[PDB]
Scaffold this motif. Structure first.
Motif, PDB file in Angstrom:
ATOM      1  N   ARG A   7      42.342  -3.425  61.762  1.00 59.97           N
ATOM      2  CA  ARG A   7      43.135  -2.865  60.211  1.00 59.97           C
ATOM      3  C   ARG A   7      44.459  -3.568  60.530  1.00 59.97           C
ATOM      4  O   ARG A   7      44.860  -3.906  59.116  1.00 59.97           O
ATOM      5  N   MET A   8      45.329  -4.098  61.450  1.00 61.49           N
ATOM      6  CA  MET A   8      46.445  -4.884  61.284  1.00 61.49           C
ATOM      7  C   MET A   8      46.096  -6.331  60.682  1.00 61.49           C
ATOM      8  O   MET A   8      46.605  -6.820  59.937  1.00 61.49           O
ATOM      9  N   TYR A   9      44.902  -7.003  61.299  1.00 63.97           N
ATOM     10  CA  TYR A   9      44.374  -8.034  60.623  1.00 63.97           C
ATOM     11  C   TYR A   9      44.037  -8.299  59.317  1.00 63.97           C
ATOM     12  O   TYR A   9      44.436  -8.903  58.645  1.00 63.97           O
ATOM     13  N   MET A  10      43.294  -7.142  59.088  1.00 62.44           N
ATOM     14  CA  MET A  10      42.856  -7.029  57.550  1.00 62.44           C
ATOM     15  C   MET A  10      44.056  -6.643  56.603  1.00 62.44           C
ATOM     16  O   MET A  10      44.133  -7.039  55.423  1.00 62.44           O
ATOM     17  N   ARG A  11      45.099  -5.999  57.112  1.00 65.96           N
ATOM     18  CA  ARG A  11      45.991  -5.611  56.212  1.00 65.96           C
ATOM     19  C   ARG A  11      47.061  -6.890  56.058  1.00 65.96           C
ATOM     20  O   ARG A  11      47.847  -6.826  55.075  1.00 65.96           O
ATOM     21  N   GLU A  12      47.029  -7.491  57.164  1.00 67.80           N
ATOM     22  CA  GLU A  12      48.035  -8.773  57.022  1.00 67.80           C
ATOM     23  C   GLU A  12      47.162  -9.818  56.179  1.00 67.80           C
ATOM     24  O   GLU A  12      47.895 -10.535  55.272  1.00 67.80           O
TER      25      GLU A  12
ATOM     26  N   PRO B  24      44.409   5.567  58.693  1.00 69.64           N
ATOM     27  CA  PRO B  24      45.656   5.433  58.576  1.00 69.64           C
ATOM     28  C   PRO B  24      46.110   3.834  58.749  1.00 69.64           C
ATOM     29  O   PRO B  24      45.189   3.116  59.551  1.00 69.64           O
ATOM     30  N   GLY B  25      47.083   3.501  58.329  1.00 71.27           N
ATOM     31  CA  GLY B  25      47.681   2.128  58.508  1.00 71.27           C
ATOM     32  C   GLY B  25      46.836   1.048  57.772  1.00 71.27           C
ATOM     33  O   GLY B  25      46.866  -0.174  57.774  1.00 71.27           O
ATOM     34  N   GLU B  26      46.138   1.460  56.558  1.00 67.61           N
ATOM     35  CA  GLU B  26      45.489   0.639  55.929  1.00 67.61           C
ATOM     36  C   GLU B  26      46.040   0.981  54.285  1.00 67.61           C
ATOM     37  O   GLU B  26      46.016   2.269  53.841  1.00 67.61           O
ATOM     38  N   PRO B  27      46.506   0.221  53.469  1.00 66.09           N
ATOM     39  CA  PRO B  27      46.944   0.324  52.156  1.00 66.09           C
ATOM     40  C   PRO B  27      46.018   0.586  51.170  1.00 66.09           C
ATOM     41  O   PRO B  27      45.165  -0.382  50.893  1.00 66.09           O
TER      42      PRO B  27
ATOM     43  N   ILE C 274      49.367 -16.507  60.380  1.00 65.30           N
ATOM     44  CA  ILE C 274      48.444 -15.351  60.438  1.00 65.30           C
ATOM     45  C   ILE C 274      47.490 -15.319  61.716  1.00 65.30           C
ATOM     46  O   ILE C 274      47.014 -14.340  62.052  1.00 65.30           O
ATOM     47  N   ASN C 278      47.896 -13.285  65.139  1.00 64.73           N
ATOM     48  CA  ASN C 278      46.805 -12.203  65.699  1.00 64.73           C
ATOM     49  C   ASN C 278      46.369 -12.704  67.167  1.00 64.73           C
ATOM     50  O   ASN C 278      45.850 -11.892  68.023  1.00 64.73           O
ATOM     51  N   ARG C 281      48.627 -11.065  69.705  1.00 61.25           N
ATOM     52  CA  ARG C 281      48.078  -9.544  69.926  1.00 61.25           C
ATOM     53  C   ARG C 281      46.858  -9.419  70.598  1.00 61.25           C
ATOM     54  O   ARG C 281      47.082  -8.371  71.390  1.00 61.25           O
TER      55      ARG C 281
END
Ligand SMILES: [Mg+2]
Ligand SMILES: [Zn+2]
Ligand SMILES: [Zn+2]
Lengths: 47, 50, 1331
Positions: A7-12, B24-27, C274, C278, C281
């Motif tokens: 989710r962090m990668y796809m949001r970024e 959560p955590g996704e726009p 990016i 990643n 991380r």
RNA sequence: CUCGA
């Protein structure tokens, strides 16, 4: 507020925009004009 | 009493709250907020009392 | 070595452990099975594969002892070194250790003074953090967002430096200064004045001080070099079928190495941000998926859809190295078989199969076969055992004799659960056990199994003959009662042998001795029951050591004469002349053990078992269906109850009674109907009318075959004969409510269809309760052993002059615990004297034993002061005299016995067995204490205080009854009057709490305004009402500040005095203050003004010291009480002392009950509310002697009600172990408000403030801790890490540099050393002294 | 997982 890294990668990656047909031609012209300065500026060196 | 503690007002601002509870955590966008509440309960494969 | 140290690991230390950097994720080759170069299994780094061979095979054969091959780099050594060589991985980016990050508390935000919610936005690459700001617009550690950093970069240029990732936290910990923040917090700690912050700033100051004391640096929280486990603790072994079988660390390690190599490749491709953000991380996620798997996010799953077991999942729980492979191992020289009974044995013997002792004693057999020359070598001695020749079974009888062998049965609850016997050799396949030791083992022969362990050495073989032999354990360590009490069949034989009939085939004859009473019984000329006159010769040894014979004709039976050839010399004939049930046999064995010794008692207990089996076989006691006798008046009682229930039923069918009245009427007319049948069957069973010597009808106690098993205590009680003749009483459905109609049919007549289905709720409830009770009762024992593991008797005497004071319990009615067995065994504290207050009868410190305690019982003594374990003065162990008497052996305890394991096993073992008016009972005198009282108007006494308890004294001095009496009761008698048994001495109302005025004078209703301060209520039936006030919430909220003070004055208006002091008397108004007697009335004393109206988890709640939900609060200090500020839900009250510091206040919610009013006086440690009290406040306000007396009178009401005797000394041991950590309030030696030991804060004052300087002061306050918390706060961290929360205990003890010392006896079990108790304790002093 | 104390 999340811990899943995907989710962090796809949001970024979501912030940037896709390219059209002429956008890739524009970026390829940018790359060619970036390397052409190195090509035409190395011509004043003994190497 | 529930209708005052409720922070939402509209339909398109209430699917966003279900999206931010479940994912959560996704726009959120609208086209992916409608499909979550649709495929949660009212789909012929993802819900079955049988 | 003698101490284990633990601290953080620098990267130089990890490089000093390492043997070579691992670079490739390869494990082995696929065609040949060889380890690859620079892999996870590499032969260069971790050593060779086979013994003394390199990889290529250029060197072999032990000639090249330590060379290194030039081709493959492998050092030629043993393959044993693959379990001891480690490697390391050079991480391409720093990453955070998960233990020092996500434990609770955070331990890395505890140092940086930053929340964990803010740190995790920087470890994940989500938000920047400012390391330093040259322009102070950006402070230290001010978190910027992603877009705000773009504004801050252009507004300042490069004056600030912000980073993101684990290197940001590493440069934040690296660029701090401990010596600035330490002195800053140490100066602002003693500047501010608060309690909510000084419990945190002390912790941060102590953390910053522990960092500089241990010598660590805070940069080592962030890993930069990660070490690799040796490749023989995570092996990769080929199975039989060609499939390999690896451990799972070769997956997590391979992930770390793969993602580290990919990060090294991505940093040289000049990738965009990016991708690198990643990749870092993912490297951090792969690191903390290895260190502790299920903590960061989702747990890492393998291919089986199972979470992989990480490194922290290998040391914790019931599968770690601690709880499964270090504290308890699997042992060699062991066995397992089904047990069977055999009565031909003695008390120290046990059977053993031949095919089991041939396998246990095999190296002993080889050593005996080689010594006699019967086989020239071991390889030719094994064939003589494989053939089972003739000479082996005659060598085994020499090997086995005088060689004891242990016998363990699981679950081993208490100390007697493992015993050592002397083996014999029987054929068959079942361990034959002695029938008397089955009470200790709790072993029923219905398929039980017992384990057989052999001792090998010559010291252990002497610790099974003098310490663990079964002839030494004939007294329980729980209590002084015997544990070789005879069981069911032998006690039925002894009950049948000692009885008497009436005619009985030749009574009335006279006999010479007991040896002519066996000759009469064997020839049949006289029955076993008779009534004869034999002539015995008993020996009394009240002459000191000498035995005096005496001869007299006794009137007795024949069986009591034929039994008396067994009893030893010193016992008198009054021990066999009774009917000899079950209690009398154990009483006889206890009398023989106390009087005569140990060596006659074993022979006596063996002959009783040999005789009780014989004379029960000759009788024949069979149960037939003619033995369960229905009482003939049974259908009449059931018909009468069926008649009486129909009257209440027809009264409910019309309107006369409610449903809740009928439901209780039916139960109350069925209970008496059940008891009227339970009386009738028992009155029919126990009486049999036999013909006398004449033609008469004399009755005797019966010879029914099912009454004799109930009367003799062998099997069954009177509660289970009622379910065979009388009716089943009242079953209950699992809601808890009682069903109305009962089971009117018993087990002889057979149940119905519905009555059998109703009878299954109770059986299933009681059978599914035992499957969930034993888990808690076996978890409490584990929590109890791991607190009191290290309490060993160390000294022999210390002069302490103090101890708790004993008193028999006197609650409600009769005494439940007399003084004879409550004080028995402990030494005395002070020289208690006769009731004539001189003439000291026992000295200061003498062991109160038998022949001393009945001497107290002759006199009228009532309270002896004894030494106790909760007040001993030594360090790291208690005295021998301060403990008392070793309950197993029967003498003073010896210096070296571990107490606390015996106390923990003794408490935790029977836990699976656990689940108005004042009317005196007898005639005696009356005493009262702490009593202020005035006479009443009619001529009797009233009481105006709280602490008063009516104590009936007998005619000699001991309190037979102790009755509470509340405030404002009106007695019938005065102080010190003779009473009659059954009379009423106190009369007071149960529902209301009146506020009776003591003053003899007029009254006036002053200071009350109707409508604003008070209310009005007229009695609508009588009219005799007065000015009342409403409740707290219901009243007007306009006048809660104006206190209605009914100030009683005379007809003039003068302030009347309190009796005996100058101050005026008022009577204030709380809620529901309904006054009755009108204005301007004349009253005397004793005149009412107003009448204001109103199992095992208990043990686990007591020992955990949990504060209850509604705690009965107590007053802090003495003084007078007035309410201060007003009700914001909770209105304050002040405790203003007459002679002390005024402004102490408090905060009372929930205004249900206030035992004090706003003008009454209190003390320290009394009642303000009511209910249960928390054990912390008993320690804070009252002394230590009121906590250790509150618990041993509260946990001793759980075991006593169930019928479980446990001596009180075993509870004070763990109460001593609770209140062990003590916090200081002053300073002068160490610190301000840190929680130290009470043993270290006592050695300081034994060093500092005696001769170094004056009283610099180390005054402390004791603290009470639960047993889940008093073991996680010890000194030796290995004794805490094996118990619970291994992550928190190992993390807390690694940033502090904690040093273990191996003091207790659970760390010496781990490291394989002699424990400092028992036989190891004598040896341990020769190590402690020469050091 | 099923069974035994
Ligand atoms: Mg059994
Ligand atoms: Zn080699
Ligand atoms: Zn002592």
């Amino acid at each position: 507020r999340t811990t899943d890294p995907v989710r962090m990668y796809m949001r970024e990656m979501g912030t940037v925009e896709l390219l059209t047909r002429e956008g890739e031609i524009d970026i390829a012209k940018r790359i060619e004009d970036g390397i052409n300065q190195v090509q035409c500026s190395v011509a004043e060196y003994p190497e | 009493e529930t209708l005052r503690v409720d922070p939402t007002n509209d339909r398109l601002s209430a699917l966003v709250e279900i999206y931010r509870m479940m994912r959560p955590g996704e726009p959120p966008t609208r086209e992916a907020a409608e499909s979550l509440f649709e495929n949660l309960f009212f789909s012929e494969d993802r819900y079955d009392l049988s | 070595f003698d101490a284990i140290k633990i601290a953080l690991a620098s990267p130089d230390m990890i490089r000093s452990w390492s043997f070579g950097e691992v670079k490739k994720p390869e494990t082995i080759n696929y065609r040949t099975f060889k380890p690859e170069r620079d892999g996870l299994f590499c032969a260069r780094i971790f050593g060779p594969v086979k013994d003394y061979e390199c990889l290529c095979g250029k060197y072999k054969r032990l000639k090249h002892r330590g060379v290194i091959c030039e081709k493959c780099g492998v050092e030629v050594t043993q393959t044993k070194v693959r379990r001891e060589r480690m490697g390391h991985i050079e991480l391409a980016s720093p990453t955070a250790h998960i233990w020092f990050l996500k434990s609770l508390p955070s331990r890395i935000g505890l140092l940086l003074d930053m929340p964990l919610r803010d740190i995790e936005r920087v470890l994940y690459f989500e938000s920047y953090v400012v390391i330093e700001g040259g322009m102070t617009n950006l402070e230290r550690q001010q978190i910027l967002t992603e877009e705000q950093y773009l504004d801050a970069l252009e507004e300042f240029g490069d004056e600030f430096d912000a980073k993101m990732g684990a290197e940001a936290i590493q440069a934040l910990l690296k660029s701090m200064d401990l010596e600035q923040e330490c002195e800053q917090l140490r100066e602002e700690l003693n500047e501010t004045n608060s309690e909510t912050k000084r419990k945190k700033l002390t912790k941060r100051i102590k953390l910053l001080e522990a960092f500089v004391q241990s010598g660590n640096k805070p940069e080592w929280m962030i890993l930069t070099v990660l070490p690799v486990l040796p490749p023989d603790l995570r092996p990769l072994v080929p199975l039989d079928g060609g499939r390999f079988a690896t451990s799972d660390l070769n997956d997590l390690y391979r992930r770390v190495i793969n993602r580290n190599n990919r990060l090294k490749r991505l940093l040289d491709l000049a990738a965009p941000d990016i991708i690198v953000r990643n990749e870092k991380r993912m490297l951090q996620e792969a690191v903390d998926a290895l260190l502790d798997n299920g903590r960061r996010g989702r747990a890492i799953t393998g291919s089986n859809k199972r979470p992989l077991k990480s490194l922290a999942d290998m040391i914790k729980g019931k599968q770690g190295r601690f709880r499964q492979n270090l504290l308890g191992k699997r042992v060699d020289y062991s066995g397992r078989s089904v047990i069977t009974v055999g009565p031909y044995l003695r008390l120290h013997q046990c059977g053993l199969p031949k095919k089991m002792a041939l396998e246990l004693f095999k190296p002993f057999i080889y050593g005996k076969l080689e010594l006699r020359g019967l086989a020239t070598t071991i390889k030719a001695a094994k064939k003589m055992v494989e053939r089972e020749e003739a000479v082996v079974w005659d060598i085994l009888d020499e090997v086995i004799r005088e060689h004891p062998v242990l016998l363990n049965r699981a679950p081993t609850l208490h100390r007697l659960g493992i015993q050592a016997f002397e083996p014999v050799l029987i054929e068959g396949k079942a361990i034959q056990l002695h029938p008397l030791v089955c009470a200790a083992y709790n072993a029923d022969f219905d398929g039980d199994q017992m384990a057989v362990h052999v001792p090998l050495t010559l010291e252990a073989q002497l610790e099974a003959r003098a310490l663990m032999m079964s002839t030494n354990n004939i007294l329980s360590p729980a209590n002084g009662e015997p544990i070789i009490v005879p069981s069911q069949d032998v006690v039925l034989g002894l009950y049948y042998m000692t009885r008497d009939c009436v005619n009985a085939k030749g009574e009335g004859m006279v006999l010479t001795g007991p040896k002519e009473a066996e000759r009469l019984y064997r020839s049949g000329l006289a029955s076993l029951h008779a009534r004869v006159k034999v002539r015995i010769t008993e020996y009394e040894k009240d002459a000191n050591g000498e035995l005096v014979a005496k001869t007299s004709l006794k009137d007795t039976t024949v069986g009591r004469a034929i039994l008396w050839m067994i009893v030893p010399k010193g016992l008198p004939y009054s021990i066999v002349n009774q009917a000899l049930g079950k209690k009398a046999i154990s009483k006889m064995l206890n009398t023989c053990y106390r009087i005569l010794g140990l060596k006659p008692t074993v022979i006596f207990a063996d002959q009783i078992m040999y005789t009780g089996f014989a004379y029960a076989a000759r009788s024949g006691a069979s149960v037939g269906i003619d033995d369960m006798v229905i009482p003939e008046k049974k259908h009449e009682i059931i018909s009468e109850a069926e008649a009486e229930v129909a009257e209440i039923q027809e009264q409910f069918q019309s309107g006369l009674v409610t449903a809740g009245e009928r439901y209780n009427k039916v139960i109350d007319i069925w209970a008496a109907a059940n008891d009227r049948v339970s009386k009738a069957m028992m009155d029919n069973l126990q009486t049999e009318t036999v013909i006398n010597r004449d033609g008469q009808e004399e009755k005797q106690v019966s010879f029914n075959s099912i009454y004799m098993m109930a009367d003799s205590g062998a099997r069954g009680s009177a509660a289970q004969i009622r379910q065979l003749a009388g009716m089943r009483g009242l079953m209950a459905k699992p809601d808890g409510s009682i069903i109305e109609t009962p089971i009117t049919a018993n087990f002889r007549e057979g149940l119905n269809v519905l009555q059998y289905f109703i009878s299954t709720h109770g059986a299933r409830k009681g059978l599914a309760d035992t499957a969930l009770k034993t888990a808690n009762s076996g978890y409490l024992t584990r929590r109890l052993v791991d607190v009191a593991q290290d309490l060993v008797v160390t000294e022999d005497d210390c002069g302490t002059h103090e101890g708790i004071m004993m008193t028999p319990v006197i609650e409600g009615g009769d005494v439940k615990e007399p003084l004879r067995d409550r004080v028995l065994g402990r030494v005395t504290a002070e020289d208690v004297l006769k009731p004539g207050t001189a003439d000291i009868l026992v000295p200061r410190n003498t062991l109160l034993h038998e022949q001393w305690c009945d001497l107290l019982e002759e006199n009228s003594v009532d309270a002896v002061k004894v030494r106790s374990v909760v007040s001993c003065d030594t360090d790291f162990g208690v005295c021998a005299h301060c403990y008392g008497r070793d309950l197993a052996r029967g003498h003073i305890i010896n210096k070296g016995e571990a107490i606390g394991v015996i106390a923990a096993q003794s408490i935790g073992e029977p836990g699976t067995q656990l689940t108005s008016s004042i009317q005196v009972k007898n005639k005696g005198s009356i005493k009262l204490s702490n009593v202020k009282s005035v006479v009443n108007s009619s001529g009797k006494l009233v009481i105006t205080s709280r602490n008063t308890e009516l104590k009936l004294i007998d005619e000699f001095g001991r309190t037979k009854e102790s009755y509470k009496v509340p405030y404002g009761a009106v007695l019938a008698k005065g102080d010190g009057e003779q009473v009659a048994g059954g009379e009423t001495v106190a009369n007071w109302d149960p529902h209301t709490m009146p506020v009776i005025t003591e003053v003899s004078g007029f009254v006036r209703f002053t200071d009350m305004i109707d409508g604003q301060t008070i209310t009005r209520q007229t009695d609508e039936l009588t009219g005799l009402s007065s000015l009342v006030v409403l409740d707290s919430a219901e009243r007007t909220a306009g006048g809660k500040d104006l206190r209605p003070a009914l100030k009683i004055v005379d007809a003039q208006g003068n302030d009347v005095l309190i009796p005996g002091t100058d101050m005026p008397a008022q009577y204030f108004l709380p809620g529901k203050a309904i006054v009755q007697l009108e204005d301007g009335v004349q009253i005397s004393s004793g005149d009412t003004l107003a009448r204001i109206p109103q199992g095992l988890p208990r043990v686990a709640d007591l020992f955990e010291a949990r504060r209850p939900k509604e705690p009965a609060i107590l007053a802090e200090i003495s003084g007078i009480v007035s309410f201060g500020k007003e009700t914001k839900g909770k209105r304050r009250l002040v405790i203003t002392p007459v002679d002390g510091s005024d402004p102490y206040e408090e905060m009372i919610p929930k205004w249900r009950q206030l035992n004090v009013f706003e003008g009454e006086r209190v003390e320290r440690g009394d009642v303000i509310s009511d209910g249960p009290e928390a054990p912390h406040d008993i320690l804070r306000l009252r002394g230590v002697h009121a906590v250790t007396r509150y618990i041993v009178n509260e946990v001793q009401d759980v075991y006593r009600l169930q019928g479980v005797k446990i001596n009180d000394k075993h509870i004070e041991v763990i109460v001593r172990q609770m209140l062990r950590k003590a916090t200081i309030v002053n300073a002068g030696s160490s610190d301000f408000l840190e929680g130290e030991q009470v043993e270290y804060s006592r050695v300081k004052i034994a060093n500092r403030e005696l001769e170094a300087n004056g009283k610099v002061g180390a005054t402390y306050s004791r603290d009470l801790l639960g047993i889940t918390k008093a073991s996680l706060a010890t000194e030796s961290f290995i004794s805490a890490a094996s118990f619970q929360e291994t992550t928190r205990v190992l993390t807390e003890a690694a940033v502090a540099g904690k040093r273990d010392e191996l003091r207790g006896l659970k760390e010496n079990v781990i490291v394989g050393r002699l424990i400092p108790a028992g036989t190891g304790y004598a040896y341990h002093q020769d190590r402690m002294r020469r050091r």
